[PDB]
PDB file of C-alpha atoms in Angstrom:
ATOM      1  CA  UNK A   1       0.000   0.000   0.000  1.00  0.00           C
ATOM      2  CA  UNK A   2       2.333   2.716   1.303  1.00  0.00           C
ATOM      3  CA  UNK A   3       1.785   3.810   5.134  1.00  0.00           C
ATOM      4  CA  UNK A   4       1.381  -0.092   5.561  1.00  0.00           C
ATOM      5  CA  UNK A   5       5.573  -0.325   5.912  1.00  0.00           C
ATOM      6  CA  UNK A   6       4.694  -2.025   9.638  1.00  0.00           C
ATOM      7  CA  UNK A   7       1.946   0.360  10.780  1.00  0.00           C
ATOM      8  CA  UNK A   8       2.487  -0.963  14.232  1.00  0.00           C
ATOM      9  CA  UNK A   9       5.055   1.739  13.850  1.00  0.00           C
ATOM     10  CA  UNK A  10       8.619   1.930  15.030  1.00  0.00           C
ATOM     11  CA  UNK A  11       6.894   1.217  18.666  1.00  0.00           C
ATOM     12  CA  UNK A  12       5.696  -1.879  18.351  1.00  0.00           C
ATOM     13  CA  UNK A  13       8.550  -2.237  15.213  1.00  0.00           C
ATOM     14  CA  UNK A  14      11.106  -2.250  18.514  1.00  0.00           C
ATOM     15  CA  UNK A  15       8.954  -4.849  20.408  1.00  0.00           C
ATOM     16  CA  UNK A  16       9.607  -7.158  17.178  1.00  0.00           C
ATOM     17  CA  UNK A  17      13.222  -5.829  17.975  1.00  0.00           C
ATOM     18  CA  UNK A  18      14.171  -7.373  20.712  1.00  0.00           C
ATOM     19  CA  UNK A  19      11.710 -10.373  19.744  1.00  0.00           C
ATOM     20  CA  UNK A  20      14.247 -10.683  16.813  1.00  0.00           C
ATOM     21  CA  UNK A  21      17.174 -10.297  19.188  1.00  0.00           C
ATOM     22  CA  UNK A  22      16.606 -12.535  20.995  1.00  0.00           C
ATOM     23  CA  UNK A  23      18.413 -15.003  19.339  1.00  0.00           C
ATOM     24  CA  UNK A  24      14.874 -16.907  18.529  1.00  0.00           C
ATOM     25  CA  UNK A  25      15.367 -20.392  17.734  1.00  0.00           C
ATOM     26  CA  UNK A  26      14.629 -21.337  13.734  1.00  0.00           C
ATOM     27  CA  UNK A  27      17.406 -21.003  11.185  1.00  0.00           C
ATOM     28  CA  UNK A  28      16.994 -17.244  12.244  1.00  0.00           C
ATOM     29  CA  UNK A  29      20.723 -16.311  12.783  1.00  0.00           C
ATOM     30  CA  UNK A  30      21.722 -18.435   9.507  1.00  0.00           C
ATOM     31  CA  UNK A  31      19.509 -17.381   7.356  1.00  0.00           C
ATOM     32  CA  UNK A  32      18.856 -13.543   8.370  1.00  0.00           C
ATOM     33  CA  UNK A  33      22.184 -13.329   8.851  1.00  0.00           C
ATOM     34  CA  UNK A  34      23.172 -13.566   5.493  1.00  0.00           C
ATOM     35  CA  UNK A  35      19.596 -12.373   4.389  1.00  0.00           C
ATOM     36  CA  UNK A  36      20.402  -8.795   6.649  1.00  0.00           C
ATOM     37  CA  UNK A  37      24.176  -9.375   4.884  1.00  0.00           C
ATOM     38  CA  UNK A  38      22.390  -8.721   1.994  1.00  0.00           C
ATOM     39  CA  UNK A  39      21.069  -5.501   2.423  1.00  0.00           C
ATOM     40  CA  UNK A  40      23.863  -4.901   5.056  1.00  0.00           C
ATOM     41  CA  UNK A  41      22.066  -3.310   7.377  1.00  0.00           C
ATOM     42  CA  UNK A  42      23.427  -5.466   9.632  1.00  0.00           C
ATOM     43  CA  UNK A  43      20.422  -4.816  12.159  1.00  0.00           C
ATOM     44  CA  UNK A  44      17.960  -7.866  11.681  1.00  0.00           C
ATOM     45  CA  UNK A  45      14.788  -5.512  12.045  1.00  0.00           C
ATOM     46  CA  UNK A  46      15.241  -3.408   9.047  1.00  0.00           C
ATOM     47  CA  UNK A  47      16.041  -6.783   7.138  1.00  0.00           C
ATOM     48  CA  UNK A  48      12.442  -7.954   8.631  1.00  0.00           C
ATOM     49  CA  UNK A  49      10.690  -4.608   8.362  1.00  0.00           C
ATOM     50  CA  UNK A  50      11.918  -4.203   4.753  1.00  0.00           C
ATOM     51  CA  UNK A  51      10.039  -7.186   4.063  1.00  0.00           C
ATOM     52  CA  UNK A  52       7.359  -6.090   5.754  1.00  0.00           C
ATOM     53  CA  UNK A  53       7.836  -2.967   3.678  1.00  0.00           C
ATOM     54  CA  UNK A  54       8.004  -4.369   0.338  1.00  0.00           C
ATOM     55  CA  UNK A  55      10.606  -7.769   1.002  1.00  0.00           C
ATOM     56  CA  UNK A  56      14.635  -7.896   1.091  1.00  0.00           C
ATOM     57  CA  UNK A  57      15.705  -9.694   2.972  1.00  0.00           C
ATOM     58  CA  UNK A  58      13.749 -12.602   2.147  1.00  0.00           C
ATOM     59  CA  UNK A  59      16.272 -13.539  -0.726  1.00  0.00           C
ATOM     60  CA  UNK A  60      18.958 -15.013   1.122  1.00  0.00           C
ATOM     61  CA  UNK A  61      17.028 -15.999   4.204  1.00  0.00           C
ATOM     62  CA  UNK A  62      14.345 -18.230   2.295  1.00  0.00           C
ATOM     63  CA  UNK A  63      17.120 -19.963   0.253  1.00  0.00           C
ATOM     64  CA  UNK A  64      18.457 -20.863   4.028  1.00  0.00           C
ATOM     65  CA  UNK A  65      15.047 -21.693   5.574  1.00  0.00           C
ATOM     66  CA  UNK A  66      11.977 -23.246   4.471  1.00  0.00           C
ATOM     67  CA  UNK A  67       8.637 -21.501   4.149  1.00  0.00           C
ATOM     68  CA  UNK A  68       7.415 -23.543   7.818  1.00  0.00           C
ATOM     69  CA  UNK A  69      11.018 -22.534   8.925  1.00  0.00           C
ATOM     70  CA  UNK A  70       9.906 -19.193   8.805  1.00  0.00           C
ATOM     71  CA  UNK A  71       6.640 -19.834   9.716  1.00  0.00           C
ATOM     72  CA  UNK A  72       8.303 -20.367  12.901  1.00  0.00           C
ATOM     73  CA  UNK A  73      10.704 -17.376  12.931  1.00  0.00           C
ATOM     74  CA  UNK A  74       7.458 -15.567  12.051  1.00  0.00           C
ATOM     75  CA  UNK A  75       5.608 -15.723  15.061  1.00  0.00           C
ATOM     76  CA  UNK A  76       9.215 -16.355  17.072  1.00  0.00           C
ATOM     77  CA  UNK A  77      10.382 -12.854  15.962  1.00  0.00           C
ATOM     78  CA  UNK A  78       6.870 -11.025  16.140  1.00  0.00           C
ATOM     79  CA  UNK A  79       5.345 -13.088  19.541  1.00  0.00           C
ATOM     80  CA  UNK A  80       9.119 -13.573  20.422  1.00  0.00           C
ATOM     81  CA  UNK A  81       8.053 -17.457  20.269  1.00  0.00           C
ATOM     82  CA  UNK A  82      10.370 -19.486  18.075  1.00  0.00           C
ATOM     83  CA  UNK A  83       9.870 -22.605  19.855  1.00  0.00           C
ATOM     84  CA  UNK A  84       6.018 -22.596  21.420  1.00  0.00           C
ATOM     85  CA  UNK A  85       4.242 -22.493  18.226  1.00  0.00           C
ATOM     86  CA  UNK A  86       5.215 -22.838  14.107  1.00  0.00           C
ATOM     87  CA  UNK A  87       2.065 -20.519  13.632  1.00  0.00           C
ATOM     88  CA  UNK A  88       0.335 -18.721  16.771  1.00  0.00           C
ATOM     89  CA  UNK A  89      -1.474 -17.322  14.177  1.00  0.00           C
ATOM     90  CA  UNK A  90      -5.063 -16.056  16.121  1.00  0.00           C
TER      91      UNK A  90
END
């Protein structure tokens, strides 16, 4: 859309922050770490909130991890839940 680049704004953005840092579980440090190599912004959130944007770091990340990989890392990096649930979901 446009003001849809995370409309939970930077707020909630930085909640997802440290639910990103904290080291989650999933192929998260593999795969984003290469994926946020990518765009080299070597902070994992604007990697995740560039997808959330319009993708980025999705490219090197998803050739890592599977689709259910990042189901997981999904809801681990936005619930801060990489191990509870694949999919919290509702």
């Amino acid at each position: 859309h446009h003001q849809e680049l995370c409309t939970k704004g930077d707020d909630a953005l930085v909640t997802e922050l440290e639910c990103i840092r904290l080291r989650i579980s999933p192929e998260t440090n593999a795969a984003f770490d290469n994926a946020v190599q990518q765009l080299n912004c070597l902070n994992r959130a604007c990697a995740y909130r560039k997808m959330c944007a319009t993708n980025n770091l999705e490219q090197a990340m998803s050739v890592y991890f599977t689709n259910e990989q990042i189901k997981e890392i999904h809801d681990a990096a936005t619930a801060c839940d990489p191990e509870a649930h694949h999919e919290h979901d509702h």
